[PDB]
Amino acid sequence: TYIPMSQRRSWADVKPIMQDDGPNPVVPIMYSEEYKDAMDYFRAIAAKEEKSERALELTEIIVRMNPAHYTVWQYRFSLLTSLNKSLEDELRLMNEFAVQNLKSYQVWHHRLLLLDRISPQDPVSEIEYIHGSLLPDPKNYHTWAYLHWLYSHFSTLGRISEAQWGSELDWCNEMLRVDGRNNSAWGWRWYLRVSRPGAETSSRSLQDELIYILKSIHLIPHNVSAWNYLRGFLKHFSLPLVPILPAILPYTAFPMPSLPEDTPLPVPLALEYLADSFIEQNRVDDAAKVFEKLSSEYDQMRAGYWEFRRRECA
Amino acid sequence: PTASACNIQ
Amino acid sequence: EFTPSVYSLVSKPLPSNSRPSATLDEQAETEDLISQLFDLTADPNALEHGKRYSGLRKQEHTQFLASFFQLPGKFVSLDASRPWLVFWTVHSLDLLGVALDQGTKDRVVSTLLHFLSPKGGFGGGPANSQIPHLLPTYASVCSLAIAGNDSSTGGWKDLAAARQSIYEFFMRCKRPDGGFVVCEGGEVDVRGTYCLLVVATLLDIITPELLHNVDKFVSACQTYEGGFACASFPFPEPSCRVSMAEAHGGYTSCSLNSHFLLTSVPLPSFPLSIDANAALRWTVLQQGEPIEGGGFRGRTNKLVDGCYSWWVGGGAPVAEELVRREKSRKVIPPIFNRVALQEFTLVAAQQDPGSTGGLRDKPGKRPDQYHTCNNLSGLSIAQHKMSHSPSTVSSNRLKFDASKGLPAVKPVAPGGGWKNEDERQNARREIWANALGWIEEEGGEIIVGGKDNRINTTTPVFNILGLRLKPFINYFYCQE
Ligand SMILES: *C/C=C(\C)CC/C=C(\C)CCC=C(C)C
Ligand SMILES: O=S(=O)(O)CC(O)CNC1CCCCC1
Ligand SMILES: O=S(=O)(O)C[C@H](O)CNC1CCCCC1
Ligand SMILES: O=S(=O)(O)C[C@H](O)CNC1CCCCC1
Ligand SMILES: [Zn+2]
C-alpha cells in the first residue's frame, strides 16, 4: 500500500503545489498516484529552491518513473553539487540506469556532467565500462557520442596516454572483427586513425590504412560501411583513385580479392568508384556510361540520382 | 508488436 | 522511368558474402517482414482479389490521433514532451486535411501558453513544473502557428510579447564554440541549433551575437560519409573541430536545415560552407532496396524506419538546393525514388487496416504519434516536388515593408546587435523573404495510388503547411 507524502512525518512541513496546465488542457496524461504525488511535492521543493537530502531522494523517485524528465535531472545535479555528495556513488547509481534506460538523453548527459566535474586523472575505468556497456547494443548512438566526448575531453587535458590510444584501436579492431557491418565502429576508427588531433599521419600510416580498408572490402564486398570509409579516406587525403583501381575492378564485372560465395556482381559502389575514376581521368563519356548503367540496371532505386550524375558529366 | 525505440528528446 | 515502383523491381536480399554478422541477421529478418507485407498487398499503381488495399486510411489515422481527451498512464515517459504530442497531432491533422473547431484550438493555445515561462521559452510541461527547453520551444511555437491566430486569444499576441525573453533565454543557452545547450545544464547538439534557428527566424529575433560560431559548429558536424553527426568537438578560436559520431538521419536533417536557415543571413563570410554534394550523396544512399519497401534508414547498415522518411527524405530538397547553388557558384529528374517512398508509407508504414490506426516505424512495431507525424511529413515531400525558388524570393523582396515590424531585441552585449537600422532591415528582409521561398512545383505532383491518397504540402526546413507558415511569420514581421 502506498503512503501519501501528506501523511509522511518528514514532509509534514511542506505544502504541495498542484500542476497548472490550465482548464481542459489538451494531451493530458493519466499519472499514477505515486507520480502525481511526487511531482506535487517537487513543484514545492523547486519553487522554494530547497537543497536537501529529501529533495535528492525525491528526484531519484521521479526520474525512475520518468527517465526523461530533464527538469528533475537538472535539479538533481544541482543537489549533488550543492550538498557536495559523493559523485562516485552517484556514478554507480548511473550504472543501474544505464542498464534499462538505454536511450535517455538525460541519463547520458548526467553521466557526462559527473565525469566532467570529477575529472579523474585517468579515465581508463570509465572507458572500460563504456565498452562493456556496448555489448547489449553495439550501435547505441548515445554511447558512441559519449565515448567520443570522453576521449576528446580528457585528451585535451593531456590524460590519454599512447598506450591508451593503442589499446583503444585494438578494441575497435575487435569490434569490427565481430561485426564488420558495424558502422559505428567504422566511425570510431576514423576518429582514432584520422580525425583526432593527435592522429599519426605518415606516408606509411596511409599504407597500413589502405591495406586495412581493402582487406575489409575483400572480406565483405557488399559492405557499404567499408566503401564509404574508402571514399572518405581518398578524399580526405586527396589520394588518386586510379592506382588502387585494380583491387576494385573485379567487383565491376595492395590486397586483391579472392571470390567469396553469395557475392552477386556487379557491386554498385564499385561502379561508382569506376565512374569517379573515369572522371579523375577526364573520361566523362566513359563515366556517363557507367552512371547510366547504375541508373538503368544495377541500382534502379537511385535511377534519378545516377541520371543526375550522368548529366553532371555532360 | 513492440514499441519503437525512437527518442528525439 | 527514374522513380520505379517497388513492384516493378526484383526483390533480392542483401548479399551475405559468406560472412554473417549480427547486423545481417537483423537485416534479413526485417527484409522478410517488409517483403511479405508487400506480397499480401495489392500494387498501388495497378487496376489482386483477396489482397489488402494499400489506400491511405485517413479516417483511421484521425481517430488514432483523437486520443484531445486523455492519454494512458504509460505516456508518463513523455510527460516532458507534451508540446511534441501536441505538434505531432495538430500537424498530422493538418496534413490529413482535418480541421479543428475553434473551441478545440483555443484549448491547444491555452495549454501551450501555460508552458511558457516569463523568463523566456517553453518547457515540456506547465511552467511551474518544467524549465524552458529548445525542443518544446520549437514544438510549441510551431503548434501555435497551426492552431492559433491573431485575436486576443490566438496566442500569437503572447509570443510577440515574449520575444525579448525568448531571445534572452536563447543567449543563456549559447556556448562560445557556436553550440547551444537544450536547457540549463543540458546537452549540446544540432537538435538545439535547429530548433533555436527555426524560432528565431519566425519570431524576428536573430542577431549577430546569436549566430557567432553557430555556422562553424554545424559544418564541423559533417563526417566522411557525407551526412552530419549530432555535434562537433572544439579542441582549444579552436584549433580544429571534430565530428563526434556517425552521420545520422535526424542530425543530418537538423544540420542541413540549420545551415540553410543561416545562408540567408547578411553576415560576411557566413555561414561556413558544407559539402553539399556529399550531403546529397549520403541522403540518397539511405533509401532502402525494393525488398525493404524503398523506405529510408537513418544510418549505414541499420534498419529502415518510417520516421526517417521525414528526417532523411525531407532533407533531400534542402541538399538538392544547396547543390544547385554550388553549381551556379562556378558557372531534371527526381533525386530520390519519390514513388517507392510513398509505397513504403502506404503498404508497410500504415497500421493493419481495421484496427487502432496510425503509422509506424516498420511492420512489427506499434504505431505512435511521432511516427504518424513523420511518416506523413515524408509522404508530403515525396508527393509534392518542393523547391526553393529565387524568383519567388525576389518577389518577396519587392513586397517587403521595412517600416512595419515589432520592436528590435535588446542585445546582451552592447555591440551584439546589427551595426545599424539599414543592416538590420536588410537582414529582416533576407530572412523573411527566403523563409517564404519554398514553392510546390506545378506539374511536379506525384500521387501513388490515386488522388484520394493526396495529403497537403509541408514546407521543408520548418515542417508546417505553407498556409500556416505564411500568415504566421507575416504576423511577427508585421507584413500581414
Ligand atoms: C528511431 C528514430 C530516432 C532515434 C530519431 C532520430 C532523429 C533525431 C534525433 C532528430 C531529432 C530532431 C529534432 C528533435 C528536431
Ligand atoms: O479506412 S478509412 O480510414 O479511409 C475509412 C474506414 O475505415 C471506414 N469504412 C466505413 C465502414 C463501413 C461502411 C462505410 C465506411
Ligand atoms: O521562469 S519564471 O521565473 O518565469 C517561473 C519559474 O521560475 C518557475 N520555476 C519552476 C518551479 C519548479 C519546477 C521547475 C520550474
Ligand atoms: O486518382 S483518381 O482521382 O483518378 C481516382 C481515385 O482517387 C480513386 N480512389 C479510390 C476510389 C474508391 C474507393 C477507394 C479509393
Ligand atoms: Zn522511427
C450: CB partners within 8 A, 6+ apart = C55
Instruction: Please state, in angstroms and rounded to a whole number, the distance separating the CA atoms of residues A174 and A188.
Output: 12
Please identify which of the residues C43, C106, C204, C305 carries the catalytic annotation.
C305
Instruction: Please state, in angstroms and rounded to a whole number, the distance separating the CA atoms of residues A143 and A151.
Output: 12
How far apart are the CA of C379 and the centre of ligand 4, in A?
18
* Cβ pair A199, A193 in contact under 8 A: yes
Q: Which of C350, C357, C352 is nearest to C64 (CA)?
A: C357
Partners of C439 in the β-ladder: C387
Q: Do B4 and C84 touch (CB under 8 A)?
A: no
Quick one: A231 exposed, middle or buried, by C-beta within 10 A (0-12, 13-18, 19+)? buried
Cα atoms in the 13 Å half-sphere on the side-chain side of C97: 11
Please provide the DSSP assignment of A38-107 as one string: HHHHHHHHHHHT--SHHHHHHHHHHHHH-TT-HHHHHHHHHHHHHTT--HHHHHHHHHHHHHHT-S-HHH
* Atom of ligand 2 lying closest to residue C58 CA: 3
Q: Is B9 on the interface with A (CB under 8 A)?
A: yes
Looking at residue C81, its amino acid is: S
C-alpha dihedral sign at A135, A139, A143, A145: positive
Question: Is C368 among the catalytic positions?
Answer: yes
Task: Find chains touching chain C: ≥3 CB pairs under 8 Å.
Answer: A, B
Partners of C287 in the β-ladder: C296
Q: Which of C455, C269, C264 is nearest to C378 (CA)?
A: C455
Q: Do C365 and B8 touch (CB under 8 A)?
A: no
* Cβ pair A225, C300 in contact under 8 A: yes
Instruction: Please state, in angstroms and rounded to a whole number, the distance separating the CA atoms of residues C299 and C410.
Output: 42
* Cβ pair A156, A119 in contact under 8 A: no
Residue C264 phi/psi, 5-degree rounding, is: -95, 10
In short, whether B3's Cβ falls inside 6 Å of ligand 1 is: no
Which residue range forms the structural domain that includes residue A45? Answer: 1-314
Q: Residue A189: which CATH number?
A: 1.25.40.120
Instruction: Please state, in angstroms and rounded to a whole number, the distance separating the CA atoms of residues A84 and A276.
Output: 59
C361: CB partners within 8 A, 6+ apart = B4, B6, C305, C306, C307, C371
Instruction: Please state, in angstroms and rounded to a whole number, the distance separating the CA atoms of residues C470 and C480.
Output: 9
CA distances from A32 to A39, A58, C72, C368, C383 (A): 11, 16, 10, 21, 43
Place of cell 553549381: C327
- Pocket probe for ligand 4: among C56, C59, C452, the residue whose CB has the most ligand atoms within 8 Å is C452
Residue A225 phi/psi, 5-degree rounding, is: -60, -50
C1, containing H or E segment: none
A93-109 as b/e: b if 16+ CB within 10 A: ebeebbeebbbbbbbbb
Please identify which of the residues C302, C324, C365, C470 carries the catalytic annotation.
C302
Contacting residues of A for C82, CB less than 8 Å apart: 27, 29
Looking at residue C276, its amino acid is: A
Cα atoms in the 13 Å half-sphere on the side-chain side of A127: 23
- Select the residue of C86, C183, C287 nearest A70 (Cβ to Cβ): C183
Q: Which of C294, C348, C309, C345 is nearest to C463 (CA)?
A: C309
* Cβ pair C457, C466 in contact under 8 A: yes
Quick one: C72 exposed, middle or buried, by C-beta within 10 A (0-12, 13-18, 19+)? exposed
Q: Do B4 and C368 touch (CB under 8 A)?
A: yes
Q: Which of C376, C372, C378 is nearest to C351 (CA)?
A: C372
C65, containing H or E segment: helix C58-66
Per DSSP, the three-state class of C55 is: coil
* Atom of ligand 2 lying closest to residue C354 CA: 7
How far apart are the CA of C347 and the centre of ligand 5, in A?
16
CA distances from C187 to A143, A154, C135 (A): 14, 18, 12
* Cβ pair C310, C316 in contact under 8 A: no
Degrees to nearest 5, angle at CA A188 with A187 and A189: 90
How far apart are the CA of A275 and the centre of ligand 3, in A?
59
Residue of A nearest to C129 (CA): A43
- Distance of residue C406 Cα from the nearest chain A Cα, in angstroms: 29
Q: Is A104 on the interface with B (CB under 8 A)?
A: yes
Q: Do B1 and C365 touch (CB under 8 A)?
A: yes
Q: Which of C180, C46, C76, C96 is nearest to C359 (CA)?
A: C96
How far apart are the CA of C454 and the centre of ligand 4, in A?
10
In short, whether C59's Cβ falls inside 6 Å of ligand 4 is: no
Q: Is A68 on the interface with B (CB under 8 A)?
A: yes
Structural domain count, chain A: 1
* Cβ pair C84, C125 in contact under 8 A: no
Q: Which of C40, C98, C43 is nearest to C68 (CA)?
A: C98
Contacting residues of B for A103, CB less than 8 Å apart: 5, 7
Instruction: Please state, in angstroms and rounded to a whole number, the distance separating the CA atoms of residues C75 and C78.
Output: 5
C-alpha dihedral sign at A20, C125, A85, A49: negative
Q: Is B2 on the interface with A (CB under 8 A)?
A: no
In short, whether C47's Cβ falls inside 6 Å of ligand 4 is: no
Experimental method: X-ray
Quote the longest CA-to-CA distance of chain C.
73
A200: CB partners within 8 A, 6+ apart = none
- Distance of residue C233 Cα from the nearest chain A Cα, in angstroms: 7
- Counting ligands in written order, which one lies closest to the CA of residue C197? 1
- Distance of residue B9 Cα from the nearest chain A Cα, in angstroms: 7
Q: For residue A119, give the C-alpha cell.
A: 575529472
Other CB atoms within 10 Å distance of the CB of residue A18: 13
Looking at residue C415, its amino acid is: G
Other CB atoms within 10 Å distance of the CB of residue C327: 11
Per DSSP, the three-state class of A119 is: coil
* Cβ pair C404, C479 in contact under 8 A: yes
- Distance of residue C431 Cα from the nearest chain A Cα, in angstroms: 30
If one looks up domain C1-480 in CATH, what number appears? 1.50.10.20
CA dihedral A47, A52, A55, A59 (to 10 degrees): 110
